[PDB]
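Quick question: what would this complex look like in 3D?
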Amino acid sequence: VPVTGPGEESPLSCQQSELWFLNQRAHLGSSYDNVQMAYRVIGPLDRQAYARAFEGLVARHAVLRTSYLRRGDTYVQKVNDTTGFAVAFEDVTGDSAVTEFLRAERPRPFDPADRHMLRVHILTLTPYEHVAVVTRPWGIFDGWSTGVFIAELNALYQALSRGDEPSLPELPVQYADFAHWQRRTFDADARARQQAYWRAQLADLPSCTALRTDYRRPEAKSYQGSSVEVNVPAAVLDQLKRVSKERGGTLYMTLLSAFATLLGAHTDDRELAIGSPVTNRPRPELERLVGYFINVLVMRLDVRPEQAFDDLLAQAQRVTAAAHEHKEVPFADLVRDLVPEPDPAYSPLFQVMFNLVPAVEADPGALGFVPLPTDSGTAKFDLNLVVRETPDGLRGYLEYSTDLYARSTVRSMAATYERLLLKIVTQPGASLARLREAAADGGAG
Amino acid sequence: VPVTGPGEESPLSCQQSELWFLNQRAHLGSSYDNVQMAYRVIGPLDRQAYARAFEGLVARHAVLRTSYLRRGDTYVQKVNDTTGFAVAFEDVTGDSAVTEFLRAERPRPFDPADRHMLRVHILTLTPYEHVAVVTRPWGIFDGWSTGVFIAELNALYQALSRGDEPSLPELPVQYADFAHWQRRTFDADARARQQAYWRAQLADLPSCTALRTDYRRPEAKSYQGSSVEVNVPAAVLDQLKRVSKERGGTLYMTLLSAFATLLGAHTDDRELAIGSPVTNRPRPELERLVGYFINVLVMRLDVRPEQAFDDLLAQAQRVTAAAHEHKEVPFADLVRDLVPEPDPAYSPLFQVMFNLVPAVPGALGFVPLPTDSGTAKFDLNLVVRETPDGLRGYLEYSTDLYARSTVRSMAATYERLLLKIVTQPGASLARLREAAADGGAG
Amino acid sequence: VPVTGPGEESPLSCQQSELWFLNQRAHLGSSYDNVQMAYRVIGPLDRQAYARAFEGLVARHAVLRTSYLRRGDTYVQKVNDTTGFAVAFEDVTGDSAVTEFLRAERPRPFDPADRHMLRVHILTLTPYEHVAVVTRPWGIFDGWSTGVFIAELNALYQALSRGDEPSLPELPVQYADFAHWQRRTFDADARARQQAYWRAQLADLPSCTALRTDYRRPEAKSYQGSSVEVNVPAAVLDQLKRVSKERGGTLYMTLLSAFATLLGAHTDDRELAIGSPVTNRPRPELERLVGYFINVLVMRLDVRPEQAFDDLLAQAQRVTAAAHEHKEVPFADLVRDLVPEPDPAYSPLFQVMFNLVPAVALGFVPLPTDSGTAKFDLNLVVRETPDGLRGYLEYSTDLYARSTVRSMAATYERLLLKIVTQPGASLARLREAAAD
Amino acid sequence: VPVTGPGEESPLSCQQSELWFLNQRAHLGSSYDNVQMAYRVIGPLDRQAYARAFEGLVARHAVLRTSYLRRGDTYVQKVNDTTGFAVAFEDVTGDSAVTEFLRAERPRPFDPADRHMLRVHILTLTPYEHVAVVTRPWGIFDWSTGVFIAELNALYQALSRGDEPSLPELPVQYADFAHWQRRTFDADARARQQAYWRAQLADLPSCTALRTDYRRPEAKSYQGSSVEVNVPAAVLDQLKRVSKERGGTLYMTLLSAFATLLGAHTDDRELAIGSPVTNRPRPELERLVGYFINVLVMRLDVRPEQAFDDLLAQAQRVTAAAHEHKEVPFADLVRDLVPEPDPAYSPLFQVMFNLVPAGALGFVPLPTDSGTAKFDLNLVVRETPDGLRGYLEYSTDLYARSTVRSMAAYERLLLKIVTQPGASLARLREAAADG
């Protein structure tokens, strides 16, 4: 229920512990982690209507106009009005100029006391070719909020290009109301229980996974990286869905088990710690809000090579069920409690991450949209597998740290993962080593 | 109408002038261009039912059991019986074994006197993983026949896996009947008119396009090559379809004009000759037959860089209309008439080819396997097809002339050129080329 | 003379006011300004001898093993022994792998308390193919020290691979000794005089030059940039040297005047403030040391288009003479004195820089590393070479597109020739002649 | 001895009976037996002097200028002049581009009536990194490659620094060798040798009954792959000591071990193995460039009840007889013995064994795999200071790579024949099966 009035300061939510200014790094910069979203617009575009649609989005979602003020040793959030926000217009001649403009625009700093947390650029190439650029600081809103943002932008533009009025559902609650409700629904006793659970679950775990890398690990992490693509056919994905439903699990569990099996070929450890971001939107009201609802959980898996893949599937099922049952405490609190002095050579509590992105859900003279490649060259962990489910199958990429790995090794790992999914499908009762050697027939590259 | 009897010897069709043995090359072999299809089957497969589906499919279509016997200076096609055809079964251990077996099985020779012109293999990896291999000599049947073949094989297996019986539409016309009809609905007069038209059209044309390559052309061609991928988003394809429809043309004309515009950057020639395979199925009772109905026509276009793209579109429309109305004479006849002595350094009458391929509980899964033969019959070969997710295909290049990076840059430039055509409705060819040149170091 | 003992904390030099940690930016990071050198080595290389040559070079120069410690409000420097330094070895397959490894290696942080200020990597491709990488933080040593570094490194390798003993001239003084001597010479009276002169010279100047840019200036500078190449043939360079000699000036003054003339076509202002780094080695003993001897001075030139090029040349001569006579006070002190509250949109006290750098078996092939950083709006760095003049024009990507900068470089190259042909014309006439 | 003059045609030598077009097969093409030889160069190289060294070496030799004209039902030779030969220069960027260029360049056809039977390419990557490629047809020259490289390098340093070339003069040209071989030849001793070869190869089965992973196709495809074989130096020294202790040689014991290894997969009593041998009499010909290789089929006995020493003695006897009857070409044996060759089978033997006899810039070879297999199995090993370094190639129509790797891992059999030389071959196989 709405419990916040105009100009009222509100406490920060649990998921808001990862914004951008609470996780600063001295040698990296405050704006190294900014998120940039660019795409190409094809067809006859009314620029003023598109800018007005962006302004309507800003005025509709209060997170985009929320400031963060320091009250003692902590922060509070304050909601402002939409006056002040504007869209920047530039004329660009060429696509290389577009790339240079994007590279120059991305790292511009954001300040917590800013009245708006968004930068929007519309670049005009021809009257039938435009580029829309949306840049935000880290921790403002997540991918589901990005899909909602895009859908509402399209709806507002279609309502505004022709002389109609917008017809959008009224938002039941704001993010400040959600923060107040979240602060109410715990007496710190639940926080104590979850902290105890996570302290017991990660006990006696190695501080760093002993992976085999191409290059020696430097004394200090550099946070540079790149990625290689991952592609899985639709028939294999359907067979994987059938396999997962036969065991009573989900597709995420099967893909996480496959990733663990793939990682088991590059390390001699019998247990792996893999981090995963999960969604926390436990109310029907919160499914259409724009905000940050993501927390990172550590999955601890036993990868002894003499066990069948079904045993690993059951273990992953149990581990993910428990992790989802204890997903309220922030990850930064776990890092602070379990890692007092962090080693600047590796990331805390886990070095590999697996992410399954939720699936994404026509006038004659309409507009076409083509996304543009935004590769920051940044890597927060040693390896990071991000995959999404598509009508044509499974798409994604494998991000890696350039301090440790060459491109060919990561390409080989991605190909091995793709082959291993098929091996899992076509060999019902194989073991981890049998599956690894069946998938290892990649012709030495 | 069916006019052939058991044991009747029928003359060859116009499209059967390029089978495999009427185009023999001494330094390549008789099986250098065998067509191999490999698929992976996922799920519980009944091997015997699937092989019996192959047997029934071979029995249904008579082209798969047709032999060719020499009669003096010509050849005649003789239909054999379905007896003697068996599917070979093998056990394999891993993917590398499958790849080695495929590259060992593809170049095995075919003989004109063979009773069946098909080789089928079923390789068993696990009870849930199978690889099916279908190999045929060139000139037997084309891609449309390949799609019909796959659909009928799936229907036959589905009807045969259970206790049911096959039930498929009847084939009113046999390919021998089509050959007889073609030879009776024809005369030396029509051939003379078409040959005269093609002699007049391809006059004062260079014997070889002066495309600037990476390496110098050898005195003899090796017929070795590779390919790179071509990808176009669906939105660009929709805008291209809108542009084509609003100009009175088709998508093929727009894509061919874009290919000509791209090729105009690598040469200083005013005219270009681009080959293109076209289908010839001029009867409603021929779209479900398995056979060869493909002929290659030469498209001649003016690519002066100071003209608008719409002028090129209109010229391409006119040229395509004329070529389609003069498409019955075989390309080999035109080569013989217009090119008496061919230079072994390059292909005759055209060196680049553009092809737009026509679009498009216990169930099994099918994953196509990559089969690159390493062959390149021309300097360049752009093969694209329409997909629900946009445009897909490849650009095949001769390795005697080009490096992989150059062809990659060419493919990226073509992909960007389609977008520049979409977004600039009045630019000239040079303007479009320089707008697409901004590729960011490639 | 040596006035320092082992384990003694010496005061910071005047040129050491801008090392890397006294000039931090919150949103950029502490290691955004690292300097990386990558070279390709061709031939049969003795790897251990070359690493030992690097170790001997480190042991030779005390700046490479100097730490900085916080004492109250300021910092002191302390020289350590050579123990601890080592060369890192990696096997790399391919050129793209080399580029990726370099990009990952460059931004690693340096700490003021580190015992050594250097990182050396030797990358082995094949027994006949190697890549040498040297990385240092900003403000450690300049380009002249880099030339001395490379020369002494190759001499050490040549005299060390064939089992001989190194033979290098002994270093008479040390950078700590130079800092002590500088403190004993420039205490408060010369400092007051120079501060007064620079306060009087730069008065009534606009905060930012009103340069016409392709894009609108953001409210906060991003410090991203790129560059385009500048090339001048040897004949034009020789004629420029001659015409500079005919009036008692040098080539630097002529090139700076040409740069000001070029920049006058993009602004309606009549006064230009151009920064230039100037070396300060006022002793015969300092000509061979490795260290930082660079200071930045601001040149104030009048660019009224009705004047002849000779008048601008004479004004540049006088301004350069005065600036060189007052080149001791650090630039950071001038910024803190004249700009108490800087604007994050533009750089303080000037936005355009001109920099003319002086001229200088295994084969060596350099690997240029474009950092993609711009500290000003425009930055011309030219080098005198036997085959003419070679360099680049670095520009901020917040304001300019590459085509405009390419046109600027072409116009500069044409303007040098037009200046050579008719040095007696006016600035507007020269711009119109070079506009073609 | 000079018995030939300019513009005069000489007949074909014995080792030229099946050169590359005299044993053609329609399905496989013509230019599939071409051999490619590539190398890498690091450091400052003078391209013009290197090309001039190549052209001078081609001028020095004589087999690189022979044309094979048709005269009725036979062929003749005709030595042309060095004019018309050149070196191709291309600019390449990257290793993958070099590999693709090599793959493109290799299979280009050769005609029996050209004037220079070789192609030379010099590819430039950087001012220091160069790639040199030499391609020639099948049967031109076989020692010949080593002397080719030696004279090429000598002429390169001769053309560098401005001094003059200094190489030994060739006493005999290949035309003189062919004339001498035809003069020192009568069709009575040759008939007796052919009769002996027919008698020795009698009673042999038409095909060996090897067990294969796949069914044999009705027509051979001539595709294949290979796997490497490695042998330590110490065990090679032990093998040489044992071979000289029993009066034999290293090749003899190696062939005996190969035969006893291949006896495991076969179910018959006798085996046939072919082996190439050099034929260079008149010892002034060891510096001559040409083709002198001929293959001899050796029939052995691999009974699982006899010992190994008697088998080694049998190998000694058969190799002595083969080297005593080492003039008749193999093509003559095929043309005479087997009436009609089955396309699924190699002629007269499916197994072959071969022992290969053994500041400046950095030369680095760039070997490539042919992908061809003329026989079911082909063992080739070359003696090196580290021991033996060779490979075993197989027909991909019959074998998977795992089986061939198992058969190679032949290894440990040298150890078990050094430890117990006098053991029976069957129990020797049983012991060697412990993998």
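Answer marked as accepted. The first strand of chain C starts at residue 10 and ends at 11.
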